[PDB]
């Protein structure tokens, strides 16, 4: 009912409801991931895990609790600590905390495990859930009490090796978004005001939501440097016998990616799932009505399913008798299955099937023998087309500007701005506050999204679009999630 | 290197084996442990096995919240861990961390299921849960937080549910026997030992000879219609009458790793069955006094490529900061099944020296014969580990007929197979009497482990070994985890 361009958050809520991706729950901010959503997580998890295993990153599991004494005697997703005080009706002798971060457990372990240069590099990953206690206005995948992620943490003898890993991981995050989810992203560096607190440098991939003009951070990969090694005394004796601090990285990516995929590819009809991650790629809809199944149509449906599955196509036959074919068409459209295969009496009488693409609605009459190759072709086409259209929208959403008087216009067009910036942090705070004020008066704030790796030329003497001081680099700004 | 002997101080041996093989890091909070990458590799092998198999059965993965409300939890709790505070302030309502997810998932099941067309519903989750007991913990075997999978299905009939119960139990037998080379006994739990709220619990039970204790390896419950009544999970059948669903739930945990360690470990540390070894063959180049250094490394990489063509999992330990003898000890204590040594002598002869971990036997193998001979050796090692463990299991069970045989058999560190009337009060009586007699860290009580599927014949008039009433079935008892 709600149109994506007119009432975006209503559209998002409804499209997620009707798609059966999630279910509600009696504790606020929590959402059940049903298979239609969880399978997408499984796909990107397998891709990213295969790739980091090639880099020698090994998975691990740390306890979810920290002792009161370890906390009393690192910035997390919650400012305060959640305490477990009882088991059943019995008070614990000492209350324990749900860990605010994994770093508080992992880094003391790293300080024990690393003693010598022979022990480096150390590369660990953990797939797990994460809890937040101070979410506001929850919404599936974007603002939740609990989400899923992977977090990698590595330690190296040199900063050069650590940085190399940071960038390799950022490239894997680009591939996670662009090759699996068909979502284009922009590689860049965070501002001093937006990077990880105690780290040296934060790199990020950023996406864009045209319907509200907002940038959204897709994933991050931090050069932590030696600051945490000094805090946690993670030292190694080098080849010459001198004690040195390790150079660390950490990197994470969450189920927020599913939300970004949803928002990127949905239309007024509902979700559109990229074929590479869809739980079902082709739904076979028999043109049947209740109490009339002779076996002719369902038998051919089953033969077609077998044939498609031998080409590794994920197929479901919706043979539920109590629904009309048109009901099923709309049901699977709203889920965003990328292809629908229609088989009725006429198709049986002709040796063909009618196949409809979800992204464009185009229909193809395809002989049974041709189904498996043609479908593979179509799915790649759909995947590619989903990405390129999104990429086009991304580039139409960014305006390259020179001066501050160009900001509020572009923000009113629901656009990001790429502007020469002196990178002075106080100026980012000033720009946020005054774009926020301006927005208020006009009826919010605009902040740095990233400093892109891809830098256009900077003419000699170009001045900062805000302070008028010498500009350092081109910086991508916008309203933000 | 391990120095405690498995048959002398079993607990010290076990701690040494799991720490020196880099599987476990002990932790500030008792009963919680850091699971290091070497352990996580084995977990990932059995996880992949079981996940692939349940996908063939149509079970889909999902993710439900880690928290559960007081009212859902108690519609149904001394192991449940309560979050009661955030910072210094009480939560308005305490919430529980999941010890299991029946009460989390089944309100959603009742919402989702309306028609016989909605069945069977088959969901699974891979996650961690928390059971905060104060009895003695053991890394892997009995912990306060652990990784597991939990599957939950709903069916139109009891018979279909029971088929799935038994199919999953067979997958747990394969998990232990086929992957981990650990023999298990299928049975049903006694009325007193079955899952609370369920109808019938089936189990696979393992045995640890060094301390004489049985342990439940995995469990598969027929929940029946009991939880369907609790949560109003109903469907309209084909005739239009409302019926309760018939449910199953099943789980298996990282306990499986503990049982593998204890089953196959020896005085030198771990022994990993080839089917779950992430490194099946470690290649050790013998570099001494610069003799053929480049040639040896090249031939090692060639041999790695050749072996990977046969799907053998190979690692070259060409780390320069360790001697060959160090690498021998390192990969032995970590339990790599096969070690391949290549030095100048081996290069000259066109062979390699291969040492199998379980027996220490050495082989001189031509390069051309390496892949078929190593495949044969690995299947021989796998089968031999299983057969030796199965022999120890058989020797650890005494078949008895009267209660005065119980304490001697328990004192030989054995289980007992006894005819039992299956009256539930007699199990409490037997636990208490055997505890008292044990006196004259873990409990000395003998409880039922399972009523085996495999039933010896019950001669007419056989008396229950404890009550003297007519025996019903043969029952396996022991001290237990
Ligand atoms: C590692 C692991 C496993 C399992 N259990 C249980 C039965 C089951 C089976 N089969 C579950 C259904 C799957 C299993 O594996 C249980 C546990 N801890 C606990 O009971 C809590 C605890 C902690 C310290 C001391 C005593 C007790 N710890
Ligand atoms: O804890 C148990 O025993 C059952 C089986 C997994 C889900 N709940
Ligand atoms: Cl997958
Ligand atoms: Cl740098
Ligand atoms: Cl954001
Ligand atoms: Cl695997």
Author numbering:
A (entry chain B): 335 to 407, 412 to 781, 793 to 830
B (entry chain A): 333 to 408, 416 to 779, 790 to 830
How does the study describe this entry?
The phenyl ring of Phe485 and the guanidinium moiety of Arg594 support the adenine equivalent of the 6-methylpyridine core via a π-π stacking interaction. The oxopyrrolidine keto O atom interacts with the OG1 of side-chain Thr592 in L95, L96, and L97. The superposition of holo-TgPRS revealed no striking steric or sidechain rotameric conformational differences among the five PPL derivatives bound structures of TgPRS complexes. We recently showed that HFG and L95 can indeed bind together to TgPRS, covering all three of the enzyme-substrate subsites. HFG and L95 compounds act as a triple-site inhibitor set forming an unusual ternary complex wherein HFG occupies the 3’-end of tRNA and the L-pro binding sites and L95 occupies the ATP pocket.
Aminoacyl-tRNA synthetases (aaRSs) are an essential enzyme family for protein translation and, in several cases, have been validated drug targets. We successfully co-crystallized all five compounds with TgPRS (L95, L96, L97, L35, and L36) and three with HsPRS (L95, L96, and L97), all in complex with L-pro.
